[PDB]
Amino acid sequence: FQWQRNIRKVR
């Protein structure tokens, strides 16, 4: 799941 905006992580 390639995050859209430079995100940290999806816990």
PDB file of N, CA and C in Angstrom:
ATOM      1  N   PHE A   1       0.822  -1.197   0.000  1.00  0.00           N
ATOM      2  CA  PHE A   1       0.000   0.000   0.000  1.00  0.00           C
ATOM      3  C   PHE A   1       0.866   1.262   0.000  1.00  0.00           C
ATOM      4  N   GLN A   2       1.197   1.714  -1.201  1.00  0.00           N
ATOM      5  CA  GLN A   2       2.018   2.903  -1.351  1.00  0.00           C
ATOM      6  C   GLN A   2       1.249   4.141  -0.886  1.00  0.00           C
ATOM      7  N   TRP A   3       1.671   4.665   0.256  1.00  0.00           N
ATOM      8  CA  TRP A   3       1.034   5.843   0.818  1.00  0.00           C
ATOM      9  C   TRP A   3       1.121   6.968  -0.216  1.00  0.00           C
ATOM     10  N   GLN A   4       0.120   7.836  -0.186  1.00  0.00           N
ATOM     11  CA  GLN A   4       0.071   8.954  -1.111  1.00  0.00           C
ATOM     12  C   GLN A   4       1.060  10.041  -0.682  1.00  0.00           C
ATOM     13  N   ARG A   5       0.787  10.620   0.478  1.00  0.00           N
ATOM     14  CA  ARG A   5       1.640  11.670   1.009  1.00  0.00           C
ATOM     15  C   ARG A   5       2.692  11.074   1.947  1.00  0.00           C
ATOM     16  N   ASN A   6       3.865  11.690   1.936  1.00  0.00           N
ATOM     17  CA  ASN A   6       4.958  11.232   2.777  1.00  0.00           C
ATOM     18  C   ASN A   6       4.449  11.039   4.207  1.00  0.00           C
ATOM     19  N   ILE A   7       4.012   9.820   4.485  1.00  0.00           N
ATOM     20  CA  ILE A   7       3.499   9.491   5.805  1.00  0.00           C
ATOM     21  C   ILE A   7       4.557   8.698   6.574  1.00  0.00           C
ATOM     22  N   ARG A   8       4.348   8.606   7.879  1.00  0.00           N
ATOM     23  CA  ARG A   8       5.271   7.881   8.736  1.00  0.00           C
ATOM     24  C   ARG A   8       5.030   6.375   8.621  1.00  0.00           C
ATOM     25  N   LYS A   9       3.929   5.937   9.214  1.00  0.00           N
ATOM     26  CA  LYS A   9       3.574   4.528   9.187  1.00  0.00           C
ATOM     27  C   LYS A   9       2.080   4.378   9.480  1.00  0.00           C
ATOM     28  N   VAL A  10       1.567   3.194   9.180  1.00  0.00           N
ATOM     29  CA  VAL A  10       0.160   2.908   9.407  1.00  0.00           C
ATOM     30  C   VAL A  10       0.032   1.712  10.352  1.00  0.00           C
ATOM     31  N   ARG A  11       0.057   2.014  11.643  1.00  0.00           N
ATOM     32  CA  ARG A  11      -0.055   0.978  12.655  1.00  0.00           C
ATOM     33  C   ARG A  11      -1.473   0.405  12.674  1.00  0.00           C
TER      34      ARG A  11
END
